[PDB]
């Protein structure tokens, strides 16, 4: 096929329409991406906060092993339990 | 050019006319593909991080309950642990 300048004009409009839709999708995905990066940073800060508490409790239990305290022994079993 | 005999072009001349626009479309399509993949990886990473938060939080809550249940002992070591549990920053 050889094509009219009018069919080209409509072909150009089609491409411009799809370009607008893909730009919208980029904007939506960039906003989502920014929110996910914030959420992972905040979640990792909570992990570090809680992990620090567990490490300090571990140190207190280790320092008091001489006491032979069954309550501290139960806490050590919680600290060292797997998932 | 008349309405009977309009200017008519090859699909190759059209390709060269539209090539710049098709190149810009390709930039945004590839950006969509890259961002969709990134976002899927981030959603998995947040699920795994939230599971670790729940795991550690469960340990802290269970230790809290044991400390509360033994408050009658007046044990300064348990009091140090409760200080850790209830401490900020």
UniProtKB/Swiss-Prot annotation, chain B:
Similarity annotation: Belongs to the intermediate filament family.
Record protein name field: Prelamin-A/C
Expression sites by tissue: In the arteries, prelamin-A/C accumulation is not observed in young healthy vessels but is prevalent in medial vascular smooth muscle cells (VSMCs) from aged individuals and in atherosclerotic lesions, where it often colocalizes with senescent and degenerate VSMCs. Prelamin-A/C expression increases with age and disease. In normal aging, the accumulation of prelamin-A/C is caused in part by the down-regulation of ZMPSTE24/FACE1 in response to oxidative stress.
Compartment(s): Nucleus lamina; Nucleus envelope; Nucleus, Nucleoplasm; Nucleus matrix
Modified-residue entries (Phosphoserine), positions: 1, 5, 34, 49
Transmembrane segments: none
Positions where Phosphothreonine occurs in the chain: 2
Outcome, altering residue 24 to H: Impaired lamin assembly
Effect listed in the UniProt record for changing residue 46 to S: In EDMD2; no effect on protein level; no obvious effect on nuclear morphology in cultured skin fibroblasts from heterozygous patients
Part of the whole protein covered: 18 to 70 of 664
């Amino acid at each position: 096929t050889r094509i009219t300048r009018l069919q080209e004009k409509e072909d150009l409009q089609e491409l411009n329409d799809r370009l607008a839709v893909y730009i919208d999708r980029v904007r939506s995905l960039e906003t989502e991406n920014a929110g996910l990066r914030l959420r992972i940073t905040e979640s990792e800060e909570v992990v570090d906060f809680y992990f620090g508490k567990l490490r300090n409790i571990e140190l207190i239990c280790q320092e008091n092993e001489g006491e032979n305290d069954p309550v501290l022994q139960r806490i050590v079993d919680i600290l060292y339990a797997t998932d």
